[PDB]
A paper describes a structure:
In this study, we used solution NMR to investigate the conformational states of small-molecule inhibitors bound to LpxC, an essential metalloamidase that catalyses the deacetylation of UDP-(3-O-acyl)-N-acetylglucosamine during the biosynthesis of lipid A in Gram-negative bacteria. Pseudomonas aeruginosa LpxC (PaLpxC) was exploited when co-crystal structures of the desired AaLpxC-inhibitor complexes could not be obtained.
Replacing the tail group of CHIR-090 with a substituted biphenyl diacetylene group generated LPC-011 with improved antibiotic activity due to minimization of vdW clashes with the substrate-binding passage. To provide a direct comparison with solution NMR investigations, we determined the crystal structure of AaLpxC in complex with LPC-011. The threonyl side chain of the inhibitor features a trans configuration with a χ1 angle of 180°, a rotameric state that is less energetically favourable (7% population of all threonine side chains in proteins) compared with the alternative rotameric states of gauche- (χ1=−60°) and gauche+ (χ1=60°) collectively accounting for 92% of the observed threonine side-chain conformations. Since the observed ligand conformation in the crystal structure represents an unfavourable χ1 rotameric state of the threonyl head group, we investigated whether this group could access alternative ligand conformations in solution. Measurements of LPC-011 yielded a 3JNCγ2 coupling of 0.58±0.05 Hz and a 3JC'Cγ2 coupling of 0.77±0.04 Hz, corresponding to a predominant trans χ1 configuration with a population of 0.65±0.03. However, the measurements also revealed that the threonyl side chain of LPC-011 can readily access alternative, minor conformational states with a population of 0.23±0.03 for the gauche- χ1 conformation and a population of 0.12±0.01 for the gauche+ χ1 conformation.
Author numbering: 2 to 268
């Protein structure tokens, strides 16, 4: 495909899920060969694995004393639409969580895509690789198209679920909300996370119920969002990715570990 940017400045705002603090976000058009990067307090933070500063419950980027939390959702949308050249300006400490899914980002960007005139240099997975972490596992292997599978153990009514993204079904994961279990809420609050959490932006899961009045968006909404998360983290490779991925109980830390190992092997 051709490199892509946005045809005008796109604006978004809302609290961050973890900081609970309001952020103003502006997506700026950029020329060919610019890449995806964030901008905060006069500092450009490239959307690349080298700038990752934290990876639990979220993926956070940092550079020159400036930090931006929870970049995975907006990066996933950009990855799905193969937007390659924009600057994501942020006033605040965290990307807005909005409704907890990628819908608002996706709808606005898709509506304002500008095709540019240079072919995309894809990150193509060259060979099979497996990363593990005491039960957790992620495997990557060559594929000319992006395919991403996540399988999880939820230990509640959801049980064991899996979902597979293939190119063409991008919109089957952009509505999947971020989620939390009721048994981890106390811990989340204690370590200073989830301060922006509410039923308006988070799917809250119980043992045999959903705390959200409207219930689930999909019968397998959580694993859909996990795929959505992985695609976001995968874009930290610096280019749109072509490969086949399988994640079992993976998280941001394991996602970034795979990214870093893939980057090292193909540099
Ligand atoms: C799922 C993960 O991959 C990951 N999500 C999180 O880490 C996460 C952690 C905690 C919350 C929360 C909350 C709340 C609440 C609340 C509000 C009101 C009442 N009355 C009671 C509870 C949300 C997301 C993620 O998507 N990363 O991209
Ligand atoms: Zn997420």
């Amino acid at each position: 495909g051709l490199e892509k940017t946005v045809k005008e400045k796109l604006s978004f705002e809302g609290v961050g899920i973890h900081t609970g603090e309001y952020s103003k976000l502006i997506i700026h058009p950029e020329k060919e060969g610019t890449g995806i990067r964030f901008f905060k307090n006069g500092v450009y933070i490239p959307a690349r694995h080298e700038f990752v500063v934290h990876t639990n419950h979220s993926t956070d980027l940092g550079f020159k004393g400036q930090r931006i939390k929870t970049v995975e959702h907006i990066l996933s949308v950009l990855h799905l639409l193969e937007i390659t050249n924009v600057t994501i300006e942020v006033i605040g400490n965290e990307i807005p969580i909005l409704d907890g899914s990628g819908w608002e980002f996706y709808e606005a960007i898709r509506k304002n895509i500008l095709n540019q005139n240079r072919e995309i240099d894809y990150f193509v997975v060259e060979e099979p690789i497996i990363v593990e972490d005491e039960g957790r596992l992620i495997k990557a292997e060559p594929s000319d198209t992006l395919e991403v599978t996540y399988e999880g153990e939820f230990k509640n009514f959801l049980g064991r679920q899996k979902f597979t993204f293939v190119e063409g079904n991008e919109e089957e994961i952009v509505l999947a909300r971020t989620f939390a279990f009721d048994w981890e809420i106390e811990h989340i609050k204690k370590v200073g996370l989830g301060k922006g959490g509410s039923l308006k932006n988070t799917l809250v899961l119980g043992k045999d119920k959903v705390y959200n009045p409207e219930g689930l968006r999909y019968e397998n909404e959580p694993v859909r969002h996990k795929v959505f998360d992985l695609i976001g983290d995968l874009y930290l490779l610096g280019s749109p990715v072509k490969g086949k991925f399988y994640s079992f109980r993976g998280g941001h830390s394991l996602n970034v570990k795979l990214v870093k190992e893939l980057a090292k092997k193909q540099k």
